[PDB]
Design a protein around this ligand. Structure first.
Ligand code: HG
Length: 69
């Protein structure tokens, strides 16, 4: 449900600082980002909009899309 795909740089750097920024957001338990896949598995509290986290990543200067497939 809440696993997004990263596009604005997927390598092992952005897929880590994004995790940091994500985990810095209250309501986030774990941001399971995978660089060799380009996937962000967000373990957030229900209620936190997926598009909001995606927007947070977008506002982080990177690009992601809420796409569970
Ligand atoms: Hg990268």
């Amino acid at each position: 449900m809440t696993h997004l795909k990263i596009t604005g740089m997927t390598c092992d750097s952005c897929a880590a600082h994004v995790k940091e920024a994500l985990e810095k957001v209250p309501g986030v338990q774990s941001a399971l980002v995978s660089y060799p896949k380009g996937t962000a598995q967000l373990a957030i509290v229900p209620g936190t909009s997926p598009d909001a986290l995606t927007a947070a990543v977008a506002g982080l200067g990177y690009k992601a899309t809420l796409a569970d497939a």
